[PDB]
């Protein structure tokens, strides 16, 4: 089997991407944030505290003839941005892009933090990291990918995120039309439950490439590119008037600037992030200070290849017995 679904930016900055997901029978379609940095499929639901719902579409298990309470199971998750959610669990039929899993754990939120409530466009998350991070207790649950895997034509999914445009998540096949050149595969460590890999270095604009190992994760659920402070300082030093603002919470730059590209290494291959991809616009409406898309990972404890980096590539998440990541230009 395979599946193929379009993923759409939630706003003009590509802050996140939503993908329609069918849950239950008859289908209830919710728009979920596919997150390769977490392992829970959770949704706004008929159980979510009413004051914490503001415009989201909810899953109502009582209306699904295939829903069953996973008795005694609870979940609770905290993300890198300080957001959180928790609740109970149902099993139900879940379909993505025509690929169906029966018996998928659907984590129903009873509580969500303010950042979820305030984002009316995201109806929940669909985690795509390794199932060892799933927070369901007392019986940990599998991701949608791990449940689908054995049915798939190939044990892979691919992320093809757009810059200010829709893109695609495919399951079970490589679309050889969706990228240029060849795919370079690199080793993954699953020790922390993430798609963790080591980039071979970077370049700023037309500068020379610096060969240096940068361990980090491929995380579609993170907007920005978080890298070591040395790398990030080297990037923003090429932008006149850029600075790190403790008041704003990262590097800002004059909105009048033209940003340089940023290149990262994948083995001997190179992925180029155009400068435009690194502009996240005014820090507040009408400001002439703009927020940067490359930020320091210092204090986060891991480097994160988030959407800024991933949307410059066609990315293969190879979930074979020895997992690997693949990157191609596009
Ligand atoms: Na922000």
Structural features, described:
There is one protein chain. The protein is mainly beta. It has two domains: 5-174, Acid Proteases (Cathepsin D, subunit A, domain 1, Beta Barrel); 175-330, Cathepsin D, subunit A, domain 1. The chain is 7% helix and 45% strand. It contains four helices and 24 strands. The strands form three sheets. The chain has a seven-stranded mixed sheet with strand order 18-17-12-13-22-14-21. A six-stranded mixed beta barrel has the order 2-3-8-4-7-6. The chain has a four-stranded antiparallel sheet with strand order 15-16-20-19, with no helix packed on it. It is globular. It is classed as hydrolase. Keywords: FragMAX, FragMAXapp, fragment screening, hydrolase, inhibition, F2X-Entry. It forms a monomeric assembly. The entry is titled "PanDDA analysis group deposition -- Endothiapepsin ground state model 22". The protein: Endothiapepsin.
Q: What is shown here, in short?
A:
The chain has helices at 114-118, 144-148, 229-236, 307-310, and strands spanning 3-9, 17-23, 28-35, 41-43, 68-78, 84-96, 99-112, 124-127, 156-160, 167-171, 180-187, 196-204, 210-218, 225-227, 243-245, 250-254, 262-266, 269-273, 279-282, 289-292, 294-296, 303-305, 314-318, 324-329. With 330 residues, it is mainly β. It has two domains: 5-174, Cathepsin D, subunit A, domain 1, CATH 2.40.70; 175-330, Cathepsin D, subunit A, domain 1 (Beta Barrel).
């Amino acid at each position: 089997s395979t599946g193929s679904a379009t993923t759409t930016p939630i706003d003009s900055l590509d802050d996140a991407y939503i993908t329609p997901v069918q849950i239950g029978t008859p289908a209830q379609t919710l728009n979920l944030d596919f997150d390769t940095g977490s392992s829970d499929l959770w949704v706004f639901s008929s159980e979510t505290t009413a004051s914490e719902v503001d415009g989201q579409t909810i899953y109502t298990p009582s209306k699904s003839t295939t829903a069953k309470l996973l008795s005694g199971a609870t979940w609770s998750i905290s993300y890198g941005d300080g957001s959180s959610s928790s609740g109970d669990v149902y099993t139900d039929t879940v379909s993505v892009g025509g690929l169906t899993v029966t018996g998928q754990a659907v984590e129903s939120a009873k509580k969500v933090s303010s950042s979820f409530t305030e984002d009316s466009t995201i109806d929940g998350l669909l985690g795509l990291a390794f199932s060892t991070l799933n927070t369901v207790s007392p019986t940990q649950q599998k991701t949608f990918f791990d449940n689908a895997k054995a049915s798939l034509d190939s044990p892979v999914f691919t992320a093809d995120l757009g810059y200010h445009a829709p893109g695609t998540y495919n399951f079970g096949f490589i679309d050889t039309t969706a990228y240029t050149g060849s795919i370079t595969y690199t080793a993954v460590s699953t020790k922390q439950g993430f798609w963790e890999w080591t980039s071979t270095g970077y370049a700023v604009g037309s500068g020379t490439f610096k060969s240096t190992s940068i361990d980090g994760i491929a995380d579609t659920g993170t907007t920005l590119l978080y890298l070591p402070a040395t790398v990030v300082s080297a990037y923003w030093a090429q932008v006149s008037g850029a600075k790190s603002s403790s008041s704003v919470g990262g590097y800002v730059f004059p909105c009048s600037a033209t940003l340089p590209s940023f290149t990262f290494g994948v083995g001997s291959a190179r992925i180029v992030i155009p400068g435009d991809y690194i502009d996240f616009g005014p820090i507040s409406t009408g400001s002439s200070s703009c927020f940067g898309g490359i930020q320091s990972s210092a204090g986060i404890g891991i480097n994160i290849f988030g959407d800024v980096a991933l949307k410059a590539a066609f990315v293969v998440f190879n979930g074979a017995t020895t997992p690997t990541l693949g990157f191609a230009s596009k």
